[model samples]
Target: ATEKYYIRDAITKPAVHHESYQKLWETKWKKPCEMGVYPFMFGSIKDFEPVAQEIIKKGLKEPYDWDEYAQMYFPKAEELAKIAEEAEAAGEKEKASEYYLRSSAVYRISRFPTPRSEKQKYAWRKGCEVFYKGAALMEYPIKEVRIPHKHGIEGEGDVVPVNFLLPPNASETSPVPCVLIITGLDGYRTELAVWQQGWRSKGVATVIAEIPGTGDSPALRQDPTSPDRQWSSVLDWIESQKAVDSKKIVAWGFSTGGYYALRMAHTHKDRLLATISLGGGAHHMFDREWLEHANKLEYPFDLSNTLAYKFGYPDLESFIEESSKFSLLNDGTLQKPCTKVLLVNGNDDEIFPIDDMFVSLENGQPKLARMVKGKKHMGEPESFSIILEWIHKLLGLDGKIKEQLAMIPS
Candidate 1:
């Protein structure tokens, strides 16, 4: 039986799914692509137009051959990458950087949500490779740093990969506040690095790290304690950096990453100045009933199945059965004292219920929250500014929202 929802009837309604992949692009993804947002961050429609046509010509459909579907965009990715390389060789550094980001965008979409297939895995690898290449050419280049995963056990990798950027003139004498941006299930460091430049311009360092079970993170996905260990190692490294003010660090987590952010606010309460869990869930999200129907909801792909894979479950049934243990509420995390945390999401989010937000507020130390009246998911256009304003005040920065907005590539 399904659990009752607190929001509007839309919470229980099935989201509309497009009959064709082309329609999915046009009706759902086109605007974001044009706007250069998530899954499409640093992306342009010009790069995606042909890829959409290719999918249409191939006549792909639901339950797609994952590898074949991934391969459809490879040629375009390769072409853009080649263009990027050519521009680099011709001393057109800016053009090369833009093209590299464009190439990464195509590969990102090819592996969007999760790289479940072999070719999609290839796309993920290529995407990250080119992304760094482009980022290195930026006015404020982002660098890749591998922190030793000291707490990791066998079967997990030895290092955690992160995209790090420091503000100009940052040093031990002038250490700057840092924002640790945690990536979600599908959005990796490559795409989330979009926030780096804005933070840099505002005289704040940025560290973009993927959560366990996603991207290049080396933690064991199935283990709930993996993230605890992962974050400990990351903070250990951050504290050692001369250019970062460890006391002023903030953690900002997006979507699935938000869950970890909320947990960290409790788990690592002493280490952070503040935490923001944007579109994160605390308890009810792990409910079996919610997981059962999430596949046909707001997310573009199979949300439940991807989550299953992310958490290292063999199948959805097992994931659902075991998921309750991962809940912050059930685990007593929410009842613990935490750093300042601001929870933001849409009132009618179908991905994770807004009820989870209420559950969070009801427990433990008081925290701030904002739910956009009639929005969905992370509450988009408004939420970004809201978060920026919150961070600005918390960090005592004088940066303007318009200035940060201007940094986004057109």
Candidate 2:
């Protein structure tokens, strides 16, 4: 829990490339080649592929246990969504909004569900589920919007799902850069849309993208390889929007989403003005503690089943052991791994805390963080305030934007 553990004036810990890490560090590469295979010889990684393939084949299921991750949130979202659906179906938009907001936790932490304490499970489950019905009732409509333009990423099936937030009292003279807010591991577009009105107040346009298997995006759900390729398609659609200012697109990503956000800025620096990360998962962000917690806190079933489900690992800790292999910047490159990035993290964060962020952050193109005080994995109200200030500064809009507005194209 990097987010949960913070050091006051804490210094970055040494990376694991030391002469003394742990038992695994010794002869990590000098495998016995099965000659001296320990009882833990996995037998073969390929042999286990079938098992991993089976879980992936199942995709994701509903009424799934939230205990393994953030269970209390979604475990009950089902019931909450039903109620909102009924109210909305009855034309109770206000009531539905109320219900929808209640289950924001589900969309916010759509990763694995987290279970509550033994005594608190029932109440916790009911707490997150209160808005389930309203969320379920909300409509996505899943339409194929047409964009009369071509871009580099315009290959076949390169569609993007965008939710529009039009500026208030807008005309051609009011054209502005669109806010490309991305969902994390999954789509919480409805909950995310609640902020549209707020953004519109400043005369900024907002577009909520359902990135692939996440949110309402159907394309990514079908193909596993496409997750890494999402920014290209989504950015293409944002650029093509008529109301958007092509020169000033800003992107925001949270959690695992920071990876995509980093990739976008890295890949499309020419097209993007700036990219922001609220909470980004750095290299092996979920390496050890997360899997360990899952093994213990998650389920009626074994942790291996949960680990296989959440990550492609066979057990909880082994996944951590392999973290270095999946690292984004363990190769020791200082020459800018990515580009035009705006990053932020807390020194005390337990999730992908500030320490790990600075670790890989050193790999990417010039990057920085506000380093919130007393903040944990979840950046709070103060974090939001800082993000707004950062956005304004990045856009070159703090003062000059008003003067430049007159020259904007219709």
Candidate 3:
């Protein structure tokens, strides 16, 4: 029998696990795909219909042949990309941007979760290319920034890649507050760019970077301290930017990135004005029992398996064995005084227990906490406004969430 942890009962109802990939898409992803949210940013239902139809017809199942699964979207992605090129050639910048992003969305879903297989890796690379192409056509183009990985070690890359967007009028004398977005395990800098235009419209700058072991991050996945170094390099680069108000910088972590946000608050206290951990966990998230059962929980794919791969472990067992060492509680991170932090999530988040949020507040400098009554995961539409309001107030800016949200392409 497996270990039964106390917090297991707190999750009143776990998500119904899907045996078929097609069913997973139909039951769980269909609405989000239609709404153009996570895993579907810059995507349209029309674009996914064909992909879904084919997946269903092929009877794709769980424990999928990821490489074969990835190939299903290539034809549509190529078609959209071609249309984008045509639009660009015709000088239809908005049309070109939309088409390119649509193309990137298909590629993104093909490599969803993590790009472990060769074809998925190809999807990730191609997705990034098209996403940037689309972003460049926007009124305020998003640019790539490569910061020196000054604290990196052997086997790691020399640079950390981040997607940056500054307000149009920002300059040395008119510096603007910057939000450093730490992307989640499945979300990369490309998809997270969905937030850029909104922030830009609010006269705020944004820098979206991947967490360690995800996307183009130059840090070792298994090394707990790798993120410390990774973020240090990013903060150093941010501070050096003339158009950035260094004293008004904030770090916001989404999902798995939320864990890092909390860690960054303490590790780089003086460097950041505030930190927000949205749907993040602290200690119990790394528990052996939780890891054992997470695969069948809220996440669509094999959650524990994906986490194992992301953390550089050969298997779930190894990851579970080593996980506690990475916890903030065990690592003395929670005991330290942190910068202003806001912990927000759904009370019933199955990805990481909400109890962990309470754990965080009890130990660190008193933090702000908001748990949506009955929501799950990142608390979605409700949490978004809550986070934005907190950030807006802290930065001394005035803007409506509705207006910023309207910037999201329909």
Candidate 4:
């Protein structure tokens, strides 16, 4: 039976923003850029629409192409980066930062579904570099942190990259509560700075990292150890910091990240004060049949191939075959009385099954679940603000950051 879903009355945003699926390509174009430039876009989303339109005109296939994808925006990004450099040299800090950020956004989108060409590799490197330069010059600085990993894909010396944004008042001597932000499959550390800054402005520090097999984590695609998992290297670092309140630390994950967050609620239970797993799945998210059909819905592109790449499987069939073993229910973790956790999703999520969260509820201690009526994957345009308030209260902080964070684009 198909599950019914509805929109909550609490959602304040207009329906136009949440309806990205209707114009699928708009979702594809806007999603990768939204995290970086939500309330403000330098060149503007309108100005960038033609680039995406051009890609569509070329009749690009789903799962997309490497060189064709990167070529579309590389020249424009290169021009913008040059403009930023000249502006920076002339002491036009704000203008320079804006241009650099714009350039970074372009480079990031060009390398969207993982780097598959020399152009994409260049884009990946430049995207990170330009964003770091841009963010550092912003009114408030955002820093890139390097955390050492013991079992990196390359070797023990390999490090996980994190975007660390601190509240203005926080310092080595004056510690603050921190939230570990785990982004969804397509979004990475650089793009998720908005969430980091959201918590930072509210006097909460944030450590943002990409889970393994996506972005820069490049470690085991699946692992749960507090010190060995995709996030463990950073968790260990966060605990060692004098500027972070160890007792009040939390984890918030979106989509696939929600899966990781729930695992943290169990595996890293002793370390986290709470966790919010929104639009995540447990077992059926890995089902081959569901994934095969997912290419045409929920997500705007080919989900099976995307999942295969993200999970380190050489093909879709292999990914489907092995995915169940990583489930919390399959592993018996859900059966235990778990720690503080929040499981939320729209009843009609297309990517990860919305009922997957409920499956976890059946086994563990009773937990909170917010099922949005008629909402889509991640329950965006409303879920984030709701999540911010919940996490704010969890950290014993108060309001208005709600209004600020609500400005996040879907």
- Number of the top candidate by lDDT? 3
Root mean square deviation (Cα) for candidate 2 = 15.2
Query: TM-score-based ranking, best first?
Result: 1, 3, 4, 2
> Which candidate should be chosen as best, given TM-score against the real structure?
1
What TM-score do all the candidates reach, one by one?
0.97, 0.58, 0.97, 0.87
- lDDT minimum window of 10 residues, candidate 2: 33-42
Q: Which stretches of candidate 3 lie over 4 Å from their true place?
A: 1-14
Give lDDT tens digits, candidate 2, residues 1-410.
53433342222332222222121112331232122121112122222223223433444233344443343234444544566667788998766755554444333333322222332244333433443343334342112233322332333343554556666555555568777777654324443554455556566777766444344443423232354455555666666666677787888876545655655665567778787777665554545654344332212223333323333444456656665543445533324445456677655554454655676566645675776767654365466666677676766545433333222111
Between candidates 1 and 3, the one scoring higher on lDDT is 3
Distance from true position, residue 47, model 4, in Å? 4.4
Looking at model 4, the pairs that clash are: 5-373, 5-374, 6-373, 6-374, 7-373
Residue lDDT tens for model 1, 1-410: 34377664554666655366876776788778888877788888898887888798888867877898989988999999999999999999999999999999989888877998899999999999999999999888899999999978889899999999998899999999999999998889998898888999899999999988889999998888899989999999999998899999999999999999999999999999999999988887887877887887788887888898999998899999899888898888888999999999998787888989999999999999988888888998798889999999889899598789767654
Relative to the true structure, candidate 2 reaches a TM of: 0.58
Worst 10 residues of 4 by lDDT: 1-10
Q: What is the lDDT of residue 192 in candidate 3?
A: 85
Off by over 4 Å in 4: 1-23, 26-43, 150-157, 222-228, 406-410
Q: Candidate 1, which segments miss by more than 4 Å at Cα?
A: 1-3
